[PDB]
UniProtKB/Swiss-Prot annotation, chain A:
Organism name: Eastern equine encephalitis virus (EEEV)
Membrane topology type: Single-pass type I membrane protein
Subcellular location, record wording: Virion membrane; Host cell membrane
Range of residues in the leader sequence: none
Segments on the Cytoplasmic side according to the record's topology features: 80-103
Full-sequence portion shown in this chain: 634 to 736 of 1239
Protein name (Swiss-Prot/TrEMBL): Spike glycoprotein E2
Protein function: Plays a role in viral attachment to target host cell, by binding to the cell receptors VLDLR or LRP8/APOER2. Synthesized as a p62 precursor which is processed by furin at the cell membrane just before virion budding, giving rise to E2-E1 heterodimer. The p62-E1 heterodimer is stable, whereas E2-E1 is unstable and dissociate at low pH. p62 is processed at the last step, presumably to avoid E1 fusion activation before its final export to cell surface.
Residue segments, region Transient transmembrane before p62-6K protein processing: 81-101
Modified how: Palmitoylated via thioester bonds. These palmitoylations may induce disruption of the C-terminus transmembrane. This would result in the reorientation of E2 C-terminus from lumenal to cytoplasmic side. N-glycosylated.
Lipidation positions, renumbered (S-palmitoyl cysteine): C82, C102, C103
Oligomer and partners: Interacts with spike glycoprotein E1. Processing of the precursor of protein E3/E2 into E2 and E3 results in a heterodimer of the spike glycoproteins E2 and E1. Spike at virion surface are constituted of a trimer of E2-E1 heterodimers. Interacts with 6K protein. E2-E1 heterodimers interact with host VLDLR or LRP8/APOER2 to mediate viral entry. Interacts (via E2-A) with host VLDLR (via class A repeats); this interaction mediates viral entry into host cell. Interacts with host LRP8/APOER2 (via class A repeats); this interaction mediates viral entry into host cell.
Disulfide bonds: C82-C103
Length: 103, 441, 441
């Protein structure tokens, strides 16, 4: 029969009947390229730290979404607050610079 | 000079440090544990073994009747079977056809095997912790002695006085109750003496293998002898010790965490890699040489020529140097980034030397101390080729050890851009708020 | 028939109960503890005793010099004193005036008294609890046996099987470390082996009274021999064991709470009156008689003729009764208010019998279970005259035992009066609210 045992950096000991126990340790030889492109970096760290990599990527995406939404919300609110004073005043100078900084 | 530090509770992995006595050149110190033994205190509760059923000759009373009496024998059984007409080789034993009684007797004894084939039930309490420590320092060869890991009892090892602190973890693989059979130890909540059930582990219990008071709890029941036959038939629950020996399960030797190795003389758990061990060693004053009497090393430049973050000493580095008074000079890396294989090197007036190291960092950056001087080594390390190895890791892996320079760059870009987005939005909001204020005023 | 109950952990005070088996007359049961022993598990750490300074003959090298060597003798001291000119009965020992040398040696060994007069340092762990129980039931005379207070191990006491639950309190007077000297036990936190200080308890430590490895820590300093005298003078710190003998203080035997008595073979604490002890006793089936076969009592009238709530059986009561078959009848009081002295009485067709009881209540009220029946006894008890007595109280005092009828009357008057006055105020407020309502409507 064929039996597969998971070995980590902590090590694993197996004893085959009447033989002295043998100890083996797994090295950090996971597949990937930590110096390559983002997909190769993610592959390397996923193979080395599956759960940690999943949590990290999900946290980064959540942070990016929350930050981009907040940034866009603040910028759009800024545009509304900056331009509203002039919408209620059709006969206004409306300097060209206003259309460049607040838009 | 007393050197105090904390070393990990690892066996076969040497602890290296430099004893720096003000005014004297550093003395290299290396402390390695040969074995660590947790020796608990045990009290023998009772001994269990396979029972033997002793059956004395039945009393065949012809033309009459007899009565059974109680006796101080374990699980003693006595019953009078009336109406027997036994036959022997010489014919009918009794004259009367039915007025005859056979009194059968039986009791339980320890079998002959009980002297050798028996299980000892022990109560286990916190005991003591001992270790065999291998120490070398300076030019003194390796010396070792048995020491007590309690932080109090000092040990004299090669003129050096060693005090090994208590283990930071009080963990022990033995429960309050263990069963020792042969060379194997089992964590088994054995029944209290006098409570063992028939056909179970404790069916037969004896305070010691040579005691004269035996507890036996088996359904020993005398059956009626077959018609015309002089014999003492009986039924009994099969030995619960034999049953146990079938269903023992996995011994503690095969399930103890942290790789503990269980020994019986005395009962102990060896090489348990739990916690860390504080240490204090008083190095003899004669082992130190004044600073002005040792070589001065300068112009150090460290180049990593090859590196792989394997568990072995996969790293190789070359250090160029200039010095004077050519002679031996210790080498040490105080940080955990890299473990140096060599303990000392021979330095000429000028040249270079090489050393090997083991590191878990993909971009190791560690300080190397060359006696009175130090240099910073930096480089890149390749992944190891072997998936599985038969030796423990020499280095220690840190949280940031695996993060490459590229990963750091991406993290920096992520955080910087995200923060800049929020910062820019807030600045724009503040600017427009001020403009509106100036509009009103 | 198994009877289970909880009895107080008191020595010399019997526990009385009626074993009520459905369909059979009650069987009186009396369980009394003769002694209770807490026997902890101990590990001998080392033996301390007064040291002896062994001083081998000095080596007087005339016209030359010698060098001391290191030896494993405990606290070994060796010093070379140059310029000695010793004289003996024969005159000048050496020729040369200043070129001769005396080597002095001294080492510490256990004194002869250490065989008998020594202190044993023990580490104490939770062990076992044992007791001697005296039991009588029905017409069976008093029987006793030594039992283990485990709650599982049964003991056969006169055909009855007794199981005693573990003590409700795990309290033990012994600390984690104790020192046994002579007949006394001290809760002394002795220093670990190898760390004893000169002039203190642990100055000399030995793993056993016969161990060949003796630890000795005394400031043994060899002094220069006096001019012209061949001798090996030395200074040493007085033994710390003798100093401890002077300052050892009060032993555990004299300060242990709960009146524990300390014994050494094995080390144990006796008669510690802590908590309560569960009990389970199986009364043999033969001890029970069918109800129809025993006397039936009726028209029971209990009169308290005299009562004093003294520690002894100061109460006397008379019970009038009528009974058929004029047989024997167990007497018991299941309420804790009073403990009955008599276990049973002899009944006639009609008459009265007297019994004695001890109660702490100033107005006792208790149910007296005359076999298969019951009578309520009530009375008034006077205070005892003796201020101090040399015997323990036979009864149990309760929170309300001392509250007299007058005290209850005053408590009821104060509580009721204040409550009624409060209710009067609330009622008046509600009534006036209704009066105002009717004023508007
Ligand atoms: C073990 O792993 C190999 C691939 O490495 C696979 O072919 C085999 O089926 C596995 N066996 C079990 C029992 O999982
Ligand atoms: C101590 O270490 C050295 C070198 O590793 C070795 O020669 C020696 O045998 C070790 N001591 C023991 C007791 O194993
Ligand atoms: C048990 O009690 C009886 C009467 O109280 C007494 O004579 C006997 O000695 C007691 N047994 C023991 C062991 O003290």
């Amino acid at each position: 029969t064929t039996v597969n045992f998971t070995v980590t950096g902590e090590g694993l000991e197996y004893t085959w009947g009447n033989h002295p126990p043998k100890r083996v340790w797994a090295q950090e030889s996971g597949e990937g390229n930590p110096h390559g492109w983002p997909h190769e970096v993610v592959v390397y760290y996923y193979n080395r730290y599956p759960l940690t990599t999943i949590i990290g990527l999900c946290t980064c995406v959540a942070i990016i979404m929350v930050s981009c939404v907040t940034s866009v919300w603040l910028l759009c609110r800024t545009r509304n607050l900056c331009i509203t004073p002039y919408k209620l005043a059709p006969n206004a100078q409306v300097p060209i610079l206003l259309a460049l900084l607040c838009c | 000079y007393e050197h105090t530090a904390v070393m990990p509770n690892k066996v076969g992995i040497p602890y290296k440090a430099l004893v720096e006595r003000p005014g004297y050149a550093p003395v290299h110190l290396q402390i390695q544990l040969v074995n660590t033994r947790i020796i608990p205190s045990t009290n023998l509760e009772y001994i269990t073994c396979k029972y033997k059923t002793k059956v004395p000759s039945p009393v065949v009373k012809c033309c009459g009747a007899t009565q059974c009496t109680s006796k101080p024998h374990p699980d003693y059984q006595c019953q009078v079977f009336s109406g027997v007409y036994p036959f022997m080789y010489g014919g009918a034993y009794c004259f009367c056809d039915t007025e005859n009684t056979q009194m059968s007797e039986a009791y339980v004894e320890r079998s002959e095997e009980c002297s050798i084939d028996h299980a000892k039930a022990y109560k286990v309490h916190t005991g003591t912790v001992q270790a065999m420590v291998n120490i070398t320092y300076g030019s003194v060869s390796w010396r070792s002695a048995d020491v007590y890991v309690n932080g109090e009892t000092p040990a004299k090892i090669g003129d050096a006085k060693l005090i090994i602190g208590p283990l930071s973890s009080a963990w022990s693989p033995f429960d309050n109750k263990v069963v020792v059979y042969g060379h194997e130890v089992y964590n088994y909540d054995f029944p209290e003496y006098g409570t063992g059930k028939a056909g179970s582990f404790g069916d037969l219990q004896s305070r010691t293998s040579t005691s004269n008071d035996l507890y036996a709890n088996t359904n020993l029941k005398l059956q009626r002898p077959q018609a015309g036959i002089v014999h003492t038939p009986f039924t009994q629950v099969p030995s619960g010790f034999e049953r146990w020996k079938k269903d023992k399960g996995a011994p503690l030797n095969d399930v103890a965490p942290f790789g503990c190795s269980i020994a019986l003389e005395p009962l102990r758990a060896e090489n348990c890699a739990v916690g860390s061990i504080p240490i204090s060693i008083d190095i003899p004053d004669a082992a130190f040489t004044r600073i002005s009497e040792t070589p001065t090393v300068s112009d150090l430049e460290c180049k990593i020529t090859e590196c792989t973050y394997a568990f072995d000493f996969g790293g190789i580095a070359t250090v160029a140097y200039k010095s004077s008074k050519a002679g031996n000079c210790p080498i040490h890396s105080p940080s955990g980034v890299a473990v140096i294989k060599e303990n000392d090197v021979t330095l000429a007036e000028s040249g270079s030397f090489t050393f090997h190291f083991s590191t878990a960092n993909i971009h190791p950056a560690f300080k190397l101390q060359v006696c009175t001087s130090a240099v910073t080594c930096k480089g890149d390390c390749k992944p190891p080729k072997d998936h599985i190895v038969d030796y423990a890791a020499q280095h220690t892996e840190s949280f940031t050890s695996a993060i490459s320079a590229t990963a750091w760059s991406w993290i920096k870009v992520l955080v910087g851009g995200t923060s800049a987005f929020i910062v820019l939005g807030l600045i724009a909001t503040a600017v427009v708020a001020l403009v509106l204020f100036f509009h009103r005023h």
